Amino acid sequence: SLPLNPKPFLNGLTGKPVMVKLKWGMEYKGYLVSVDGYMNMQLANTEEYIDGALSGHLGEVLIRCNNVLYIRGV
Amino acid sequence: MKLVRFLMKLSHETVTIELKNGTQVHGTITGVDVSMNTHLKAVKMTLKNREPVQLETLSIRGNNIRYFILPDSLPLDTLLVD
Amino acid sequence: GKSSKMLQHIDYRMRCILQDGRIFIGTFKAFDKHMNLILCDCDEFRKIKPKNSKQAEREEKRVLGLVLLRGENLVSMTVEGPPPKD
Amino acid sequence: EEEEFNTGPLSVLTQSVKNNTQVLINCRNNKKLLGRVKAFDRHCNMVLENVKEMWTEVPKSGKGKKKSKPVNKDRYISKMFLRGDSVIVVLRNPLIA
Amino acid sequence: KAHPPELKKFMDKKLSLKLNGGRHVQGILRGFDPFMNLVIDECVEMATSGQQNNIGMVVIRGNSIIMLEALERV
Amino acid sequence: IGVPIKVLHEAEGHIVTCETNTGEVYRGKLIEAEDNMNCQMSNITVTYRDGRVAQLEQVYIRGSKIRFLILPDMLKN
Amino acid sequence: MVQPINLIFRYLQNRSRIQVWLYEQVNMRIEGCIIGFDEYMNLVLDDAEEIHSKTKSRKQLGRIMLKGDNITLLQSVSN
């Protein structure tokens, strides 16, 4: 109902389990540790998923704004 | 925090550079800019699926630069200070 | 500080290889901060750069005149020789 | 500039250069470099030393009928500098220690 | 600095636009923005099979804008 | 101001060609040469990468998809 | 003179289901009701669903954040 921008959705989604998918077809699912202003983010306890199937958990991972395509709640 | 000043201060040193297109080029860098543009002279460049060729002048822009490997004996700890 | 690396190859015939794979050999008479080059007497060849070719030295060579190479598709450049008097 | 770089995602890389820990940087070229970055920048450009670069390749029609198998390749570098444009992701975890 | 695109002569005229990925649309330009974001009123996207689907007025970004062709007299 | 943008603005009024990143080469009178590489021509002949050529009464290509441009070299000398 | 940012703000305030096409990827697009947008083209879509035209499949993800660089064109939808 209320107007939720992308910066407020990224600030409210920090600390919770979400999934950030990139343009290359892969995605990182995990807890959002911190976010940046240039679309960059750092997650803790993240796992990689390619084609809807999990491959392995890497822990903390940093995704840039150019490589990250979208981010949703999980 | 500014790597352009560290890249421009490495002139006269021999290093290799592998761009995003898969081609490699090893030679002595003569000029480094703030935008990562590297100009060298008398460098040997070998592309992907091609033979090596020597160039007396080669200027690669910073937008096409993928990775650069300098020498292991270079003072990277002393050159990082501004 | 000096910026003479772009002015040293200015007015001379250079052969630059773009990101698309073509080789444009022409007199580099114009430059810019975005790497946009101006080639007077520029010839574009996409087959191979002729460097002592026994079978052929010019394959798929097209003359353009005043060519304007965009800096967004620039990959590398090479010097061929000095420019003419005219 | 320093507080946003230390508290944001770059602080996850800040433990890699400040603590001398190992991290894996993957790019769009299908290569992964494992090692510690000695210096970093705001544009994601990094410079490290003693990094192990590993990737995968194929024969590329070596038999003559488009038949090839995947093969892993690895190499070491005593010093290297990777730009921030070609960098895709960087993961910091307990791998170098 | 920060000048917009030349859309004053093509504004309110039925023309075709080429979007990235081989996309083709046709509509009336109801206005433009400084970041290349234009408004296409009565847009009809022509698919690769030959059929055209009318989607109405939409917003086209300037990043994937290939080229515009005026279908009327300017 | 760049030398290439000044050459593109000075190239208006004559016939020139512009090839995009997808191989589409549009040749015609340079009606509008913006500073952002936006090239607007009138009655331009556009030839795609497949070889088919067509004529447009008014075409306008943005500067983000500009590959190269060939104008007359008589004005440079 | 109807600008694209004003039309995007009106579509976000109306709460209608809009479909966004991917930039350089036309085989799959997104669809949903955007609640708000940002200055860098990033929007917050509520009930987002990725629709692939090649396979005819729809995968819903919920509240998603779409970046302005990945979306090339955005149109309106009835559903």
Give a quick summary of the entry:
This is part of a larger assembly, with seven protein chains of seven kinds. By secondary structure, chain C is mainly β.
**Can you write the helix and strand succession of chain F as a string?**
HEEEEEE
- Beta content of chain F comes to over 45%
Order of helices and strands of chain E: EEEEE
Distance separating the two termini of chain F: 20 Å
Strand content of chain E: over 45%
Report the helical percentage of chain F.
10-25%
- Secondary-structure-based class of chain E equals mainly beta
- Given helix and strand content, the structural type of chain F is mainly beta
Tell me about the largest β-sheet of chain E.
5 strands, antiparallel
Rg of chain E, Cα atoms, Å: 12 Å
Largest interface comes to: E-G, 26 and 22 residues
The CATH topology of chain F comes to SH3 type barrels
**How many β-strands of chain F, per DSSP?**
6
- Bulk shape of chain E: globular
Query: What's the total number of strands of chain E?
Result: 5
Helices of chain E, by number, come to: 0
Give the second-level CATH assignment, the architecture of chain F: Roll
CATH class of chain F: Mainly Beta
Largest sheet of chain F: 6 strands, antiparallel
Instruction: Report the oligomer.
Output: part of a larger assembly
PDB class: splicing
Keywords: spliceosome, splicing
Entry title: Cryo-EM structure of the cross-exon pre-B complex
Chain A: Small nuclear ribonucleoprotein F
Question: Which tags fit this structure?
Answer:
part of a larger assembly, 7 chains, C: 86 residues, mainly beta, 5-stranded antiparallel β-sheet, 1 helix, 47% strand, F: 77 residues, SH3 type barrels, 6-stranded antiparallel β-sheet, 6 strands, 10% helix, 49% strand, globular
